[PDB]
What we know:
Blueprint: H1 5-19, H2 30-43, H3 51-66, E1 79-80, E2 83-87, E3 97-101, H4 117-125, H5 127-140, E4 150-153, E5 161-165, H6 178-197, E6 202-205, H7 217-234, E7 241-246, H8 249-260
Parallel strand pairs: 2-7, 3-5, 3-6, 6-7
Antiparallel strand pairs: 1-2, 4-5
Bound molecules: ligand JNT and zinc ion.
EC number: 3.2.1.-
Protein name: Protein-ADP-ribose hydrolase
Organism: Methanobrevibacter oralis
Amino acid sequence: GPMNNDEQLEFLINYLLDERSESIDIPKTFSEKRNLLRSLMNMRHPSNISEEFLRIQDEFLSRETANKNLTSVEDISLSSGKIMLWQGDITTLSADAIVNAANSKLLGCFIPMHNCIDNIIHSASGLQLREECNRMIMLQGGDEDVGKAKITNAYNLPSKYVVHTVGPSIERGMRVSSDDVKKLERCYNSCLELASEYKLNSIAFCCISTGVFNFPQKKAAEIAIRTVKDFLNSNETSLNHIIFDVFTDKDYDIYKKLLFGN
Ligand SMILES: Nc1ncnc2c1ncn2[C@@H]1O[C@H](COP(=O)(O)OP(=O)(O)OC[C@@H](O)[C@@H](O)[C@@H](O)CO)[C@@H](O)[C@H]1O
Ligand SMILES: [Zn+2]
């Protein structure tokens, strides 16, 4: 019984629904079915699942990834030495490592359909990403501190690895402290160091802490660029491309000014 795309979606939804206590009339349209799969994956605490599920999940998500408009590193025109600036979706970029602005529990996002980068990454990667992270935290015996990095396989993403970092959060209407700056610096440093240790050719950062974490976007960009330039000026590294993956026009305009205003 080889399965077509729709049968794979049905199988995945039904497997996860059978695990849940709640009853949900199965949706009809493609948006409703796909969004249900993502919701159920989002909510699923780590627990053993069938080799069959994971096989089918991988086929489905891998096929979804292949059918996106993907970007290779060599496709990116806008570079300043090893630094690249690129606006787009990090789940469609075939960098060796992408950086996830993760939470301190590191299991991804359990809020269904939440468009934080953590949810988006886990949703495209597969449930193995949450599982790998669960193991790491279990063994660590504790929540992940801000300003660190853990690397995992990227699974069904077009990248090879996900580097998970937890950034500083700025409370509504409060200024950034020196400690806040040092924490964000540390996230950039820790990701660059880990990807360098793993002998990677490329890493793509998201704009850490500038979404829901309210880090002022000019200030964050200045830190990110300074930390990356200091790192390249001070270290031998396998890294040949450090990609600033921006998601908003506002971030693009900021990074463009800072990198190419010269
Ligand atoms: N597909 C995409 N590709 C590239 N960039 C994307 C993206 N989707 C969103 N972004 C951008 O990712 C950055 C981090 O935002 P986010 O709001 O995801 O992240 P942060 O502001 O760093 O806040 C951290 C929280 O999300 C975190 O602690 C947890 O609670 C998670 O569960 C912002 O610049 C977003 O616009
Ligand atoms: Zn979220």
